[PDB]
């Protein structure tokens, strides 16, 4: 296969020298991709030279690619990127078949490690929005392809919280939903002021606000949407988790979290920790009469008004914040209490699993999965 | 009408400003309760049995 | 049995798009034919406060973005006239040097008017001197040797510098001839210009000498 | 004449007094409206007097004029561009001189406006965004802000930097307008830097004061919004009564979430009587009312933007009617359960025990209440003197 990529290597550079620059604004020719395959022919040969596929793009059995399975990567470009020719992006119709195989044949697979499959799934989103975004792309498929990506987003900031940093890093995570969440507030509104109007859009921009409760300025921008977005059900709930995590609210902010969405559990997921603490510090403060004296509170209680797995997981949470837990009452010392230092490991939480009651493929797509995709590409 | 207009001039040294000496009242938080809806709200708390003790 | 009462800042990540800075459209089009997503955390902490011609000082680990900063400020406030250097990039290293000049070449894609050029050691003086004479650049970037050797000589006409900036400005102020260098080229250029000095591992100790080279700088460390 | 008006602006620049020049290129001078002066191609004569770039600029002026005599705007924005470019060419061009100030005052502010007429005869033809002139013209008010701020070198009554604050203002009304906050963050942080800070116009240090308590406002800093905001309605002009009612309409939400109430007859004196009743139910402690009056000019406060700040007075109208709790049944020891009636009565979503003591846990962390929970009783045991301390201390 090298000779093979060294082929094509050496058309591109010929293409590529009779390429122009230094053009004029006025003069500027948008990129029109012409790629009818998942993967470009000389990334497929040049990544199945280099051993660098990932375990999903190869035959079983063997380190040989499936030019079929093969899907196109994301690599930063560099200095010397040297452009993109026009075979190197696949225009819009590959980019939506792309998208449609990666929910229906990749997202629901169990063999290989959590690691693996979400490398793999988050990088080839991350060449899908480049392909995207190279090509000036501005349409509803465009918009339901980002919502895609973001979704897929949104489900891996629950579902692989619990992983090694080596495999799952919580902050590359969250940029990834919010640049996806930038992208597809921007295409809103370029649809919105070209006269066409977005399904989906409450849905996501709900998605904006469960992802900026601890920003206040959100709500600025929550006033400048369109009557029928600001009045959607999606952001009203997200209004009401925003108002009960600023005040505190940790009754109504789990009561919300039980009668959320899972996508909308995912994202309230995140600040679980903080509204416990918070909560922790309040019920320590005011159920305590004196600094000297403890009293005795049911852990029955904090398990129901913090939504607990169960009475071993709120003892640790007391326990690491220096509160007594024995016989189902924990001792809320108001001289005992401290915040420990350094954030615990996160786990997921049981309810917002059950939340999950169809394939993560459906929920990803937002709806029912499409057929599966059955395109050979050609040599 | 969404905007702050530019001033007529650049300075004015504070001889014409709009001087509004009691603009915030202080005195509204008071121990009143003879209004309307502290009597509505007594008499909610009455029908369900929480009443003032003599 | 009840006793008496006894009487006695979380953040978020910043979102932003390269729209959102206000940018010139070419450079725009040049960053979305470049595929650039969006801004990492030193490009939205440093890009408002670079176009405004304000000096800067950013450390942060390789990789984030910091070239690119200036690289967009410098392109963004360019006023290019004839005969004139108005931004100066200086770096230890001449693959450093040519890395730059690949990031504006690639900027300045829908800026035909825009010339940049590379000054560095192991050439000759006379090759500098004939691209000065003849093809005098807007943006001028190269090793301090070099530099001062052209300037020293009245071939670098360094009167009109508008943009003073620093690429891994930590190692190239470790070294004693290299500061020295800089401290010259530094006195040659007008005192009214915006300084931006950009490193990987700002120690402590160089903090005051980079600190030196502007005023009221906003300091980014990570 | 032509030839009057071009040997005047040769001699307001070589006299180098900025306020003849500034009229000279104002709009707001009658001079645009005099008939004779608006001309085509009239850089022919201004090449034979003035200088460069003065010739340039006032060619490009003289273009402007008879484009706005046709109701032309998007050629009068272009010539006001290129007005704003050569102006700026000179202003730099000038070295320890600040003299031409208000002639920046005169280019850059006729800029902006002509943006607006510009992006509102571009909505109609379907050609352009809304706001896109207003990126055009904030880039250009930049440039001038960076060529004013980079003069720190003259001396105190000789430098450029009594231009910065007006400009950033200038930029304030685009970012804004155009929904496009996160820049203003370089123009304040140049401001307090600043040394000159305090020494700047009275009405520009207003309005920088009234934009900065907005963002602060949005920011949840109810403290520096509340003195940026009462220092901006404290001296604003009082010919200008719009700009006093559209600095109130910010400073009101803020002054009730910090415990102030405005007085009936202030929001009758600056038409804001959409607060009249909402000022009431948190005085009452009244969320139904608090829900009705939000609900009623929700389209006013959504315009304004402070509906969402408004919900927040939810945590005062909780104190307020525990208050009236504790004071209608005159004891210490006080049912949760009646807290929990109090909060049906006021046809509260889905309120139970859980919630009521949520509430009352953060009230009494926050400070607004004196007292602890007991929940072997269930009760809230106050502090018998001093159980709801006024909000202004807390
Ligand atoms: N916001 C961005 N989005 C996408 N790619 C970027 C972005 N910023 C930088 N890059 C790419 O990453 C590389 C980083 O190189 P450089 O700018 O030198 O970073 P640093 O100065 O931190 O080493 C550049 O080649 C650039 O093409
Ligand atoms: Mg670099």
Redesign the interface.
């Known amino acids: 296969s090298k000779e093979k990529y060294r082929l094509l290597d050496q058309r591109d550079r010929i293409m590529r020298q009779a390429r122009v620059k230094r053009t004029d604004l006025d003069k500027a020719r948008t990129f029109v991709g012409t790629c009818l395959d998942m993967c470009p022919e000389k990334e497929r040969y040049m990544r199945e030279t280099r051993s660098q596929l990932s375990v999903f793009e190869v035959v079983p059995g063997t380190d040989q690619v499936d030019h079929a399975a093969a899907v196109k990567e994301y690599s930063r470009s560099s200095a010397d990127q040297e452009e993109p020719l026009p075979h190197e992006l696949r225009p819009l119709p590959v980019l939506s078949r792309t998208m449609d195989y990666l929910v229906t044949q990749i997202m629901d697979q169990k063999e290989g490690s959590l690691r693996d499959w979400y490398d793999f799934v988050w990088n080839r989103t991350r060449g899908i929005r480049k392909d995207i975004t190279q090509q000036h792309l501005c349409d509803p498929l465009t918009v339901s392809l980002i919502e895609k990506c973001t979704r897929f987003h949104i489900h891996c900031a629950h579902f692989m919280c619990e992983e090694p940093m080596s495999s799952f890093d919580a902050k590359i995570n969250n940029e990834n939903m919010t640049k996806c969440l930038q992208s597809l507030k921007e295409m809103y509104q370029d649809l919105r002021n070209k006269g066409v109007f977005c399904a989906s859009e409450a849905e996501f921009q709900g998605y904006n606000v469960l992802l900026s409760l601890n920003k206040g300025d959100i709500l600025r921008e929550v006033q400048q949407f369109h009557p029928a977005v600001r009045n959607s059900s999606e952001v009203k709930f997200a209004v009401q988790a925003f108002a009960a995590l600023n005040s505190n609210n940790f009754v109504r902010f789990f009561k919300l979290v039980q009668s959320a969405s899972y996508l909308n559990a995912c994202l309230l997921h995140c600040y679980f920790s903080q509204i416990r603490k918070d909560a922790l510090r309040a019920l320590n403060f005011a159920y305590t009469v004196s600094t000297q004296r403890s009293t005795i509170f049911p852990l029955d209680g904090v398990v129901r008004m913090l939504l607990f797995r169960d009475c071993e997981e709120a003892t640790d949470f007391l326990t690491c914040h220096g509160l007594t837990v024995s016989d189902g009452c924990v001792e809320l010392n108001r001289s005992a209490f401290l915040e420990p230092e350094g954030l615990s490991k996160t786990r997921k939480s049981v309810f917002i699993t059950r939340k999950l009651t169809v394939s993560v493929g459906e929920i990803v797509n937002g709806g029912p999965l499409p057929p599966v995709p059955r395109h050979t590409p050609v040599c | 009408d969404?905007?702050?207009?530019?001033?007529?001039?650049?300075?004015?040294?504070?001889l014409?400003?709009?001087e509004?000496a009691?603009?915030?009242?202080?005195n509204?938080?008071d121990?009143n309760?003879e209004?309307d809806?502290?009597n509505?709200?007594?008499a909610?708390?009455e029908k369900?049995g929480?009443k003032?003790?003599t | 049995e009840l006793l008496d009462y006894e009487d006695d800042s979380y953040v978020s990540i910043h979102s932003s798009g390269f729209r959102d800075f206000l940018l010139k459209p070419e450079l725009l089009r040049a960053i979305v034919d470049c595929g650039f997503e969006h801004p990492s955390e030193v490009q939205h902490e440093c890009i408002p406060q670079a176009i405004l011609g304000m000096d800067v000082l950013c450390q942060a680990k390789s990789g984030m973005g910091k070239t690119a900063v200036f690289v967009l400020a410098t392109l963004q406030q360019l006023x290019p006239v004839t005969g004139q250097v108005s931004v100066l990039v200086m770096c230890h290293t001449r693959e450093l040097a040519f890395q730059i000049s690949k990031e504006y070449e690639r900027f300045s894609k829908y800026m035909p008017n825009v010339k940049v050029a590379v000054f560095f050691g192991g050439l000759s003086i006379k090759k500098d001197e004939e691209v000065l004479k003849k093809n005098c650049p807007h943006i001028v970037v190269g090793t301090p040797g070099r530099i001062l050797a052209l300037a020293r000589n009245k071939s670098l006409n360094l009167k009109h510098i508008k943009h003073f900036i620093l690429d891994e400005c930590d190692k190239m102020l470790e070294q004693l001839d290299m500061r020295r260098d800089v401290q010259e080229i530094f006195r040659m250029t007008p005192h009214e210009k915006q300084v931006m000095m950009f490193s990987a591992t700002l120690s402590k100790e160089i903090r005051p000498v980079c600190r030196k080279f502007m005023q009221d700088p906003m300091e980014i460390f990570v | 004449t032509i030839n009057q008006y071009l040997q005047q602006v040769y001699e307001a620049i070589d006299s180098r007094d900025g306020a003849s020049c500034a009229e000279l290129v104002s709009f707001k001078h009658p001079h645009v409206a005099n008939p004779r002066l608006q001309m085509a191609s009239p850089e022919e004569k201004c090449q034979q007097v003035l200088e460069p770039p003065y010739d340039e600029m006032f060619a490009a002026h003289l273009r402007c004029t008879y484009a706005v005599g046709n109701h032309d705007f998007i050629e009068a924005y272009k010539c006001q561009t290129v007005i704003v470019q050569s102006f700026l060419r000179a202003f730099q061009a000038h070295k320890e001189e600040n003299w031409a100030l208000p002639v920046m005052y005169a280019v850059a502010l006729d800029l902006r406006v002509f943006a607006n007429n510009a992006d509102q005869q571009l909505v109609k033809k379907g050609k352009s965004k809304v706001g896109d002139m207003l990126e055009k013209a904030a880039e250009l008010l930049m440039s001038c802000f960076r060529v004013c701020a980079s003069d720190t070198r003259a001396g105190i009554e000789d430098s450029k930097k009594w231009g910065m604050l007006f400009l950033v203002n200038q930029l304030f009304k685009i970012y804004f307008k155009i929904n496009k906050l996160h820049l203003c963050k370089p123009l304040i942080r140049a401001i307090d830097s600043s040394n000159l800070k305090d020494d700047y116009s009275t009405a520009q240090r207003v309005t920088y004061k009234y934009y900065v308590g907005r963002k602060a406002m949005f920011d949840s800093d109810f403290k520096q919004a509340e003195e940026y905001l009462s220092f901006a309605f404290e001296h604003c002009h009082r010919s200008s009564q719009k700009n006093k009612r559209m600095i109130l309409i910010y400073l009101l939400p803020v002054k009730m979430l910090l415990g102030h109430m405005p007085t009936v007859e202030l929001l009758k004196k600056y038409h804001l009587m959409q607060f009249a009743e909402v000022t009431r139910a948190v005085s009452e402690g009244n969320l139904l009312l608090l829900h009705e009056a939000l609900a009623k000019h929700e389209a006013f406060f959504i315009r304004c933007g402070i509906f969402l700040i408004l919900e927040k007075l939810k945590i005062i109208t909780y104190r307020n009617l525990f208050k009236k709790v504790y004071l209608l049944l005159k004891t210490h020891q006080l049912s949760l359960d009646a807290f929990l009636v109090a909060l049906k009565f006021m046809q509260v979503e889905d309120v139970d025990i859980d919630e009521v003591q949520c509430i009352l846990a953060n009230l009494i962390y926050m400070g607004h209440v004196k007292g602890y929970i007991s929940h072997q009783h269930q009760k809230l045991v106050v502090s018998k003197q001093n159980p709801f301390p006024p909000l202004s201390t807390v």
């Open positions: 969404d905007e702050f207009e530019e001033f007529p001039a650049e300075d004015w040294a504070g014409d400003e709009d509004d009691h603009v915030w009242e202080d509204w938080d121990d309760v209004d809806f502290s509505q709200l007594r909610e708390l369900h929480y003032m003790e």
